[PDB]
Amino acid sequence: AADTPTACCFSYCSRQIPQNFIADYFETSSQCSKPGVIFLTKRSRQVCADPSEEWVQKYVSDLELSAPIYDINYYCSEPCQKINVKQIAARLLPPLYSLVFIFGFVGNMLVILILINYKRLKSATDIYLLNLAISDLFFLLTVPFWAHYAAAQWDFGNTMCQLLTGLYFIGFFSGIFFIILLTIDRYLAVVHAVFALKARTVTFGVVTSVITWVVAVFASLPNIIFTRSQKEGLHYTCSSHFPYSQYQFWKNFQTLKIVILGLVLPLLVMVICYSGILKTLLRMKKYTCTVCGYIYNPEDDPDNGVNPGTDFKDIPDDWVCPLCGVGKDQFEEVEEEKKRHRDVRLIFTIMIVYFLFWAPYNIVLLLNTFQEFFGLNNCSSSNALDQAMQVTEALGMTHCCINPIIYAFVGEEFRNYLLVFFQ
Ligand SMILES: [Zn+2]
Incomplete structure (x- = not known):
């Protein structure tokens, strides 16, 4: 847009x-x-x-x-007059959008087909991956229109302006929300196994997908309400227009909606969740006495010769179960394995790559929010600023073709399902 x-x-x-x-x-x-x-x-x-x-x-x-x-x-x-801005857009972006539309559409239909036919939608994680790929497609549907708009002018009319704008942002907001859900999901699976057994169900996934789409609509409502096409000196545009009495209110509101939901929020999640995940992974392991049922807690013996800062592999072989009296030999690793922990590394890649491509945009929006402060509120500045915004948006839009490439870079099951048709 x-x-x-x-x-x-x-x-x-x-x-x-x-x-x-x-x-x-x-x-x-x-x-x-x-x-x-x-x-x-x-x-x-x-x-x-x-x-x-x-x-x-x-x-x-x-x-x-x-x-x-x-x-x-x-x-x-x-x-x-924004001569330079428009002239750069029309020259460079059409062949790019061509490129990413082709790769993107193929990419994300393959992911979708595989998630439904091979990986069979077993759990909430699969559901979110699917809704992510669907968000990516909804964004892609709009790309051919934008490329034309850039090369020439809006010529699809008002309804198309309002619905394409709707699909773009619904796609944007939902895409963000599902990357966040995928991160949170993997956090519960690894840390709070407590609640993860209810949360990992397919029904749970669907109930939280349906709510999520609805919120993505609410988020997108103002964008649709205030957008229309308009003749501007025998060239047509598709853009938003705010009531002059609430203009700054809306500008600030809509911009921070995007910065907060798109940058700030997922950054908090990522840091928090991957701090969490690392601590659980690095934690010392508990053990149980085979005959006794007694659980050795590596953070907790003040009575035996046992250092509270050390696990089971440091305790000398001479050690005896305090409750019952058998030697160290009769201990096993308390049956704890992260089978629930299916796809952590993939989600972290996807989360990181999202930032790589969308951070420059969210940053440029904050620059635009504080236009007034930096004295950027004048013709010459705004042309450089608008040019930065078109560039960073272009980068951003590229990301919708990348997710399905990651599913081959750091995935495995997405590669093996291709050897099906060679052997
Ligand atoms: Zn024992």
């Missing part, structure tokens, strides 16, 4: 333009610093206007109900 503006307003008109000199108008993109109206005149030129004022609101009202030569430079301003 590009709200990349064709032009933005960093000033307005000083005095009311004569109504009859105005041909047409457009409302500027919410990607812009400031709420704005650009008026097109009965000369080719165009100028900036404040949507607050009754004259502007009345002019627009009249122009919507509808559908002499002056030098108005004395009191009006030309908008910031």
Whole structure:
């Protein structure tokens, strides 16, 4: 989704333009610093206007109900034209999106088919992997439209604008949520085996998938409500437009929705969960006395010659079960194995690679949030900033073709199911 503006307003008109000199108008993109109206005149030129004022609101009202030569430079301003931004987009991104659309679609249909036909959807983990691949496809469906939009202009109309925007973000938000669920799932399997026996069930997975999609809709509602297509001086766009009375509210809101859900939240999860997972994996192991039933606790004998900081492999062979009196020989490793712990390393790869490709975007959004602070709220800065945003978005969009390549890089069962058709 590009709200990349064709032009933005960093000033307005000083005095009311004569109504009859105005041909047409457009409302500027919410990607812009400031709420704005650009008026097109009965000369080719165009100028900036404040949507607050009754004259502007009345002019627009009249122009919507509808559908002499002056030098108005004395009191009006030309908008910031985003020539460089759009020219770079149209040149480079079409062949990339081609590329990732091809690899991505094939990739993610294969994963889906395999998860349903070979790995058979046995547990919640399989369910989330499946919903991840479906989120990735929903994002892919939209890519051919975006590439065209970049090369040319929006020509799919308003409904398509609203539904494609919907599918993009639903795909985005749900993709994030399922990577998070996959991480949390593996954390419970490894650490809190307590609750993991209820949580790992297929029914549990489906109930939490259904809720998750629904929340991904709620998350996406404002994006759909405020988005529409619009004629901007005989070029059509697909972008969002916020009410000028709540403009900053919405801008801040929607941007931080994305930073918080996309960067902050999953970073907390990842750190926490992989700190957790490492501690459990590195923990000293307990043992049980075969005849006795007594459990040796390697963190806990204050009565025997036993160092609380050491496990069973350091205790001399002379050691005898305190409860019953048999020697060390009669101890086994207390039957504890992480069979439940099926796919930890894969999820950690997927989680890391997600950051690799999407962090530059979330960072550039924070730069855009604090545009005002860095004095980036001017024409020349915003063109560099918008250009960074198109680049980092491009990177980000690439990631939807990568998941299914990881399933071969660090997976195993996804490789072996291909030897089926050679032998
Ligand atoms: Zn014993």
